[PDB]
Structures are given as structure tokens and as C-alpha cells.
């Protein structure tokens, strides 16, 4: 009805660019990532996806959300697998959520009570990004931390054979959404909001990464 697929893509161009330039991210890209700080990121996303996937299931048959309801995208379980790897068997007891992460979860829950359609901005921001960057991020992680196997279940969509073909069904799904350009714009704005929320989680880890860096180099000089 409106073609938000291209509106979201062009509309979040700037934000995605700022995302790549966050200190934490810059270091990640250049291969310097470390188990302890990255472990906290996984804990946060774990709660955000839980929130999002639970609410999305309530709207499996909603006039709008039902169109972008692909339980094949669900990351909660794979993320639990990663916590197990980074934290071990007692992970339920060691995993925690940060303030930014809580704010993130809070927004998802809020939007789900008064503007369920804004949930497409959240599904878009996470899932379509996970789908598109998943392979690059996985290798960089695997190389920078040595994860021959385990620790990257999050970047692997098991229940999706042809992912490029899924990425189309998904964009298509968005382009066939029963919404008016007015709201389609509230969705785009919400997407830029979500990006900022991801970026805030990354910034929370800057300090943890600095120490770790100082520690490895100090150990090197010694």
C-alpha cells in the first residue's frame, strides 16, 4: 500500500552509518573484541529479543503485524545458546541487563500496548539487520575471539535455507502492509529510535573494552 521497505532503508541510512562509527563498534570491526564486554551485549539482546518475540506472538493474527510474523526469525533460543557458551551452565544466574538494555526492553513493551504497528520498526531494525550483516559479524567475532564452534549461534538462522530469498519475502511483506503513508512515517522514525537504543548499549561497553585493551597490551609489554 505504501512501500515502507525502501522508506525504512533510505530513512535509516544516516543512523546505520553512526552505528558503524561508535567506538566500541569501530574496535569490533578492526577485530578487537573481547569475551567479557561482548558477553554483556549478548545478555542485553537476549532480553530485548525475548520481549519482542513474546509480544509479536500475541499479534500473530493482528491486521498488520501478522504480515511480518516469521517465527523463523526468532533469536531468543539461539541467544540462550550463546549465553550458555559465554557464561556456562549457571548462565540463568549470571546474566544481567544494563540500564540501556532495560530502556530498550521498556520501549518494546510500551509500543506493544499503545502502537503495535511501531513493532514493525523494531522487527525491521533487528531481524533485517541480523539477516543482512549476520555473516560478516560472525566471522569477525569468530576470528577476534577464536570460536571454532560455539558462541555465534545468534548469527545463524537455522530454519532459513535460502536467506536471500527470505530477505525478499520479508521486504515484500512490508511493502504489502495495510498502512497509510502517515503512519509509515511514524514507523521510520521509530526505527531511527531503535538504532539509537542499540548504540547506547554499545557505548555502555566502551569503558569495559578500554580496560581489556589496556590489559592485553600491558601483558604484551610485560
Query: Is 76 annotated as belonging to a binding site?
Result: no
Angle formed at CA 113 by CA 107 and CA 114, multiple of 5 degrees: 90
Find cell 513474546 and name the residue.
Answer: 54
69 among annotated binding-site residues: no
Alpha helix segments (H runs only) across the chain: 4-11, 13-20, 23-29, 35-58, 76-87, 91-94, 99-114, 119-123, 129-145, 163-175, 181-204, 206-221
| Position 136 contacts ligand HEM (CB under 6 A) | yes
Binding status of residue 137 toward ligand HEM by CB under 6 A: yes
User: Under the criterion CB under 6 A, does residue 133 sit at the interface with ligand HEM?
Assistant: yes
* CB distance 49 to 83 below 8 Å: no
Considering the complex, state which of residue 76 and residue 200 has its C-beta at the smaller distance from Cl ion.
200
Which residues within the stretch 183-202 sit at the binding site for ligand HEM (CB under 6 A)? 195, 198-199
Among residues 128, 144, 184, 212, the one that binds ligand HEM under rule CB under 6 A: 128
- φ, ψ of residue 55 in degrees (nearest 5): -65, -40
Please check if 62 is assigned to a binding site: no
Residue whose CB is less far from ligand HEM, 84 or 186: 186
- Per CB under 5 A, the segment of 9-17, 92-100, 171-179, 207-215 that binds Cl ion is 9-17
Any binding-site annotation on 26?
Answer: no
Known binding-site residues equal 9, 16, 124, 167, 171
Amino acid at each position: 500500500s505504501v512501500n515502507l521497505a525502501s522508506q525504512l532503508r533510505e530513512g535509516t541510512k544516516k543512523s546505520h552509518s553512526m552505528a558503524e562509527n561508535v567506538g566500541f563498534v569501530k574496535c569490533f570491526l578492526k577485530g578487537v573484541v573481547e569475551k567479557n564486554s561482548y558477553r554483556k551485549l549478548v545478555g542485553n539482546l537476549y532480553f530485548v529479543y525475548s520481549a519482542m518475540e513474546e509480544e509479536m506472538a500475541k499479534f500473530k493474527d493482528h491486521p498488520i503485524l501478522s504480515h511480518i510474523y516469521f517465527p523463523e526469525l526468532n533469536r531468543k533460543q539461539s541467544l540462550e545458546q550463546d549465553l550458555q557458551f559465554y557464561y556456562g551452565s549457571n548462565w540463568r544466574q549470571e546474566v544481567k541487563i544494563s540500564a540501556a538494555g532495560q530502556a530498550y526492553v521498556d520501549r518494546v513493551r510500551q509500543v506493544a500496548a499503545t502502537a503495535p504497528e511501531l513493532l514493525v520498526a523494531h522487527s525491521y531494525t533487528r531481524y533485517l539487520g541480523d539477516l543482512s550483516g549476520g555473516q560478516i559479524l560472525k566471522k569477525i567475532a569468530q576470528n577476534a575471539m577464536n570460536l571454532h564452534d560455539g558462541g555465534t549461534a545468534f548469527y545463524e538462522f537455522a530454519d532459513i535455507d535460502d536467506e536471500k530469498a527470505f530477505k525478499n519475502t520479508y521486504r515484500q511483506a512490508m511493502n504489502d502492509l495495510p498502512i497509510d503513508q502517515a503512519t509509515a512515517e511514524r514507523i521510520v522514525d521509530e526505527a531511527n529510535d531503535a538504532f539509537a537504543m542499540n548504540m547506547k548499549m554499545f557505548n555502555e561497553l566502551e569503558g569495559n573494552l578500554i580496560k581489556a585493551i589496556g590489559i592485553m597490551v600491558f601483558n604484551s609489554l610485560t
